[model samples]
Target chain A: VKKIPTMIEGFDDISHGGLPQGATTLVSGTSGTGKTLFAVQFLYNGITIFNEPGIFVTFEESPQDIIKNALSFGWNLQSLIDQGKLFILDASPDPDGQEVAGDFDLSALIERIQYAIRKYKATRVSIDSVTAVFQQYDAASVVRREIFRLAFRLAQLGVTTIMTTERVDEYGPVARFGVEEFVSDNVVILRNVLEGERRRRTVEILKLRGTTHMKGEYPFTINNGINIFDY
Target chain B: KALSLLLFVANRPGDEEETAAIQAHIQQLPSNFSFELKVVPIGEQPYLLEEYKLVATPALIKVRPEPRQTLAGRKLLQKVDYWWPRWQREV
Candidate 1:
């Protein structure tokens, strides 16, 4: 089946043509690995090229920070937002300058996202990072359920979503824990592995259903333009 | 570029070591390679083959580049078919 092109030049090839159109792909990496950039680029292509509107939900960074950071790539995020083609939900960095209150419910957040998608006719969503969902609660099962629930909700809405995860550095051979892998439709792992004194950026497709994909650890580099160069 | 890709079959939550063995075996091959691990949902062969047309669970197929060619079972295991035999050996 033909997948959607992420529209960013180098990224589509790594994904064997973009993500399986409207499918959720988890873009994960530790700090400095450019997970945010990857997600932004994906959404950028969605809105600009495919004409598919998307929503970006931020829990750690402010919408200002996201837009500022994306500007480094010369990505005009604000224009898309102003056009109402892209909607950003900045629910964290704690909205009130303190920890999020317990009364802040996920159902409300879900409803708000659902509202945005319908309001904008969005077909894609990028959850800035799913790590915050964990910080707000304890218990791996809770985190797992929330992740699955959110994904399920989006899937039902027919929206392709990308939810980022926080890396633990080391936990056996897997880069991410077991729960996410189970719930997500696809998993994209980005890493900065050390080979002698240099650190190499690499991308590996852990799992992608209903599509044939490249299955090796390929080297990747991000240029100053925020475009991925797959080696 | 070397030919032949490895086709692995195992359940996601069961016999994970065995699944790892199949993957490591394919990766250790000295060349650019691509492979597939058809992970089933534990003793659930119907769903897998229903989608792919495979006849057995835990099978290894060695097909060169796209159009899949050959296959085998645990009985046909080659000592070299798997890498890190002693260290990652699952059987």
Candidate 2:
């Protein structure tokens, strides 16, 4: 199967190559799990190394905030944007905003993304969390069906994606949506757990399904970028 | 294109029997209709019962084709067959 190596330190080794191309993978966790960092790094690495331009669909953080946050990782997202190597679709829940208030289905969101993909010819996409449409818009069921449609359409478009979602537990259900069993092509879970005195970070590959991965939990650390250790 | 659907079944005799019937009922739908189907037990993934607000052990969750809905309670297969025309009108 055709695959795209995430190039996020040791992810390639554990996942046994990387994420499968042209399909979305649910990268899930709770707060402080660095789930967003993983999403950004995937987009950043694809552009820097593979020359694959990407799009980041943010549902919470502002584009400015994301850029500022990535500085700690030394990832100049701004430069990437300037050079048209990256595009941050600010679907942020700005208190002062327009659109998404109609009898709006996901067609609006997906159409905008489809346009972006054609305009930028983006090969990678990331939706920060699936929780927002329910949390912010208060249309969980309506938005979720459209999201399911979007996932199918994205596969048809042949673009790879990392669709992040929130949870209350580090090792809780695959996602709050309860659709990952078939919703995504693969699953990668990030965990930031307290080990008595020291808080430890770990990453787990639930399965690549049709693809293969070195199973079980492994150590995770983020200094300049995310690093995974097998020991 | 196709609907993404799920059936939540438990180990209870009636629950499994209802699930099997519903699975068979789904297969009888028009060949033109397509979907991704998964059978899950609440015991394996407990949160689902609470997630979809499944009022009964044998429940049907229409995950795709918008307005994600949940169908439960007795005479389940009849209810599953009842919504066929409404769902097909969607995609």
Candidate 3:
């Protein structure tokens, strides 16, 4: 199996060439831990560096909003979109809006995903903040079922996907315990920790089953761009 | 201190060397943290399939007294997985 390169310098080295091919990684973190930045960089790097096309699926932000946010990090997402090398799907369903656009059914989402995979020939994908869907429901089992089915569906398409989640607990940025940990092939925890007069940002590979990884915390900073460096 | 952990491996063809090495290593470690070497024979599907969702042989699991604490690799102590057995050659 051909493995997808993380292309995040120190991170790939720590993960031993990156997450396994066709693996769905759970990039779970609290708000403003640079989740969008990390997701964009992963897909962008996969496309530009590894020659793999990507799809960015969002459930919280509209397509224009996503493009607007990417510029904060000086990323020109429009160019990629214009070139047709990147595909963005706007599925941020509104529970309060007068009318919801698209089918809004999970099947519709799956079909749209399959179409993107075939059209762009994408091998890397990101679902920006799947938590928004949970806002309309309260059942934990349903949420788990939906997320697992989504992940499995993408994995079946032979694309390595990163399903981002908004950390809902007070634990800060630890990977979601038990459930999601069992489902995902890889789990990455991104944190914005404050340590005595110092604000530290670190990322760790909590678990990557069937692979040997450098099991240590790596400090990261947004210098020029996201750089995962030694802590 | 009351929990007992076991590392399961398969007794397979040409696996004697690895089995011996693993056993030897475990034997030298602190006995208080000892893990039993349970070998499941191939085609013993009736025994292995009843409990584990084993994808491959040489799988390891950590058992605890608490309900839902059978952590696979998230132990607080690293020695559970990397505990090296002390060695003394019996002459």
Candidate 4:
């Protein structure tokens, strides 16, 4: 009854009618694994093909950098922003930096996210690199809790979301610090491994609760966005 | 009790109702409830949104008295009414 198509090449067939609609998925991978691009691609396709507004909550890359990077993919993110079809919520770190403040909850950040979702009527969301947020603060447990709250919050909003994160090993745990636990719906692993004489990139669907997907690694290439090849 | 309110308003049409609604609610506060207010239109003072994480406006933010709060949308009337007492006590 609820399955949205991501329309990301062959990923639909592999993920079984895209990601579980309105649920959060964790995209765990090391740097250069195309994690950010995958998240952006989801938002791009949602707005262009499905006409669904999307919110990209970036915690690492500046909004300008994100738009410029996607420009190389022939994705006009800035135009969408201007037209109000897509919004890039800048959750990136403060350039001025900050000293230690008294204890604070993620209330402000969460409210901002909620405000973006409501104002834009966003159906899809992408939070790039949860690790960057954890790295910013020493409160790992608290950050993890806040991330979980956000995942469930988006879930409650009925907006499908994907959060990218870093993993120390390409073929190890899904994400550092068990970040996958925060996302209840799914876990996807992106790997750029050195095999034989050439470097190969692959995507593996580690978990898709309450849904079915092809259970294996699929070869993919960075054709601006994620281009997964069928086995 | 000290109260500092940052009222963020978008320049577009129809948002003035919310802006006015919040101010009216503040005007109805209990006796001796003075306040400090600053009006910030949407486009200007870009950092207000960035600093406060305000994705949209008209957002009435109670920035003082610790534990900042944000109220948004056309329902600002109801939200202001609901939070006035809390803000009153906290301040």
lDDT: which candidate is best?
4
Chain A TM-scores, candidates in order: 0.87, 0.94, 0.87, 0.96
lDDT of 1 by residue, A37-110 (tens): 77887788789877889899877787888888887777889999989898887656323212221111243345
True contacts kept of 1: 0.00
- So what's the TM-score on candidate 1? 0.64
Steric overlap count per candidate? 0, 0, 4, 0
Q: Please, what are the lDDT tens digits per residue for candidate 2 over residues A64-148?
A: 9999989987889999999998988766543532212222344435655666676688899998977766676555666677778
- DockQ in order: 0.01, 0.02, 0.01, 0.05
TM-score of each: 0.64, 0.69, 0.65, 0.74
lDDT of each: 0.62, 0.74, 0.62, 0.78
Candidate 2 deviant stretches above 4 angstroms: A96-103, A181-184, B1-91
Off by over 4 Å in 4: B1-91
Give the CAPRI class of candidate 1: incorrect
Best by TM-score: 4
Clashing pairs in 1: none
lDDT of 2 by residue, B3-55 (tens): 87787655634555656776877877875666866887655553344344332
RMSD of each: 21.7, 14.1, 20.3, 9.4
Displacement of residue A113 (Cα, Å) in model 4 is 0.9
lDDT of 3 by residue, A1-231 (tens): 445677876778777878777878878777777677788888888877766889998877778888887787777888898888898876564333212211122433555566677778999998887666555334445555656767787889889888777786525435443345446577777778767989888777877766877776688998635788783
Model 1 Cα lDDT, one tens digit per residue, B1-91: 2243334343434456666665665566554343343333323333323233232234443333443332433432453244213223122
Worst 10 residues of 1 chain A by lDDT: A96-105
Model 3 misplaced stretches (Cα beyond 4 Å): A98-105, A169-182, B1-91
Q: Please provide, for model 4 over B2-89, each residue's C-alpha lDDT reduced to its tens digit, 9 standing for 90 to 100.
A: 7888876664455567567667667777746668767777555654676765533356777777667766544565666766777754
